[PDB]
């Protein structure tokens, strides 16, 4: 049974300790996944840090402790018991808590390449917003639309810790040449209101 | 610098096998031992087969034994997984690690130093697709514009996307694929650019789906 890995919310210059979560410590290794890589040695032998690791890491029994937490951070943390086989525990996913950052919001029509196809894509994005929480509304010619849309979400970011999301509303081109104003509305914290981002099918 | 390449990596249908490869470069291969480790979509890290470096000692992990065959030829500096009997649940991106050994009066203790890029393995009876590219045209906002390329309907994952042949990296965002109804991907990426610069500048998302052998390079430029 696959596990996804565990969430773990940390304020940068804060301290943040991992737990090995495996279900001396000589036998113990810590490694970190950034967003989109493979897994990278951190600690080995229980608390001796791999070259390049900044002072802030260190082991002890048996948890991961990173002194005060940075941006670059950011990721997936496993530990590793090096027995006769290995065995990798649950993962920590660290969230970094920055400041609240308003998402700016762009539309995107469906393209005269598309539409030849018989379908179309209209697509919202939003770029580099915190905190994760961020919701999406697809209005077509003022009605509210259910069912047809879906977004992802890219990793946090290692350098300013920010969320983008991109979600695109699908649509026959019959339909799609059937309405004219096309919006998606979007709520989130760093909004005091709601932000709007519409065209209207022609120009 | 020390490499760990993989390759083998594609769709398979369920029940059928597939083998992957991890070419070494860089380092003494022979005095080297071996794991496979394996990742599924949004999970964790689980430790799959280990050979030492004369082969002379192999094990498995109890999810794949019977099924999977780890080898290696050092005259070719190549590490082999045989998978047969595939899975659903053995969808995943599988990686090879190298093994660096400590040893004491008390015993002797190791960690992965090494490790490649990583290879996807799809078990699935679903047909390999290519995708269409269509351009994301920057809106006459001047400010900030974003503009982007739609890579739709593709079939294994994954795609690659880069802007500019890799010229441009700053402000874009490439996103994770979404399964559409149909059961292919699709997936966006997107850059913001200096709005005074829509004119002057060309960029192209330069699209690879290896899966299919497609590559695509659209131009994206603002409509009238």
């Known amino acids: 049974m696959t596990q996804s890995p565990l969430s773990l919310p940390v304020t940068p210059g804060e301290p943040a300790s991992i737990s090995c979560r495996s279900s001396?410590?000589?036998?113990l290794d810590w490694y970190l996944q950034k967003p989109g890589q493979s897994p990278q040695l951190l600690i080995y032998l229980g608390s001796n840090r791999a070259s390049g690791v900044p002072d802030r890491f260190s082991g002890s029994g048996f948890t991961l402790k990173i002194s005060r937490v940075e941006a670059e951070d950011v990721g997936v943390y496993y530990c590793?018991?090096?027995?006769?086989?290995?065995?990798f525990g649950q993962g920590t996913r660290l969230e970094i808590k920055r400041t609240v950052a308003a998402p700016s919001v762009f539309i995107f029509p469906p393209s005269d390449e598309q539409l030849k196809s018989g379908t179309a894509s209209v697509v919202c994005l939003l770029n580099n917003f915190y905190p994760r929480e961020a919701k999406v509304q697809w209005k077509v010619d003022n009605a509210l639309q259910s069912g047809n849309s879906q977004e992802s979400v890219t990793e946090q970011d290692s350098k300013d810790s920010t969320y983008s999301l991109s979600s695109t509303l699908t649509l026959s081109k019959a339909d799609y040449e059937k309405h004219k104003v096309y919006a998606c509305e979007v709520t989130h914290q760093g909004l005091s209101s709601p932000v709007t981002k519409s065209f209207n099918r022609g120009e | 610098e020390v490499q760990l390449v993989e390759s083998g990596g594609g769709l398979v249908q369920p029940g059928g096998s597939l083998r992957l490869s991890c070419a070494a470069s860089?380092?003494?291969?022979?005095?080297?031992?071996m794991n496979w480790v394996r990742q599924a979509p949004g999970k964790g890290l689980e430790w799959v087969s280990y050979?030492?470096?004369?082969?002379?000692?192999?094990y498995y992990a109890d999810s794949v034994k019977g099924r999977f065959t780890i080898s290696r030829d050092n005259a070719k500096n190549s590490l082999y997984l045989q998978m047969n009997s595939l899975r659903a649940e053995d969808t995943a991106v599988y990686y090879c690690?190298?093994?660096?050994?400590?040893?004491?009066?008390?015993?002797?203790?190791?960690?992965?130093?090494?490790w490649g890029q990583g290879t996807l393995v799809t078990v699935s009876s679903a047909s390999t697709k290519g995708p269409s590219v269509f351009p994301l045209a920057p809106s006459s906002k001047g400010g900030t514009a974003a503009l982007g390329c739609l890579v739709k309907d593709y079939f294994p994952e994954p795609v690659t996307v880069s802007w500019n042949s890799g010229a441009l990296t700053s402000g874009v965002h490439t996103f994770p694929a979404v399964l559409q109804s149909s059961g292919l991907y699709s997936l966006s990426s997107v850059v913001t650019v200096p709005s005074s610069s829509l004119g002057t500048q060309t960029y192209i998302c330069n699209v690879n789906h290896k899966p299919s052998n497609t590559k695509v390079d659209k131009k994206v430029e603002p409509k009238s």
């Open positions: 860089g380092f003494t291969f022979s005095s080297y031992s």
């Open positions: 050979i030492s470096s004369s082969s002379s000692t192999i």
């Open positions: 590793m018991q090096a027995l006769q086989t290995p065995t």
């Open positions: 001396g410590y000589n036998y």
């Open positions: 690690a190298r093994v660096e050994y400590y040893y004491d009066s008390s015993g002797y203790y190791y960690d992965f130093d090494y």
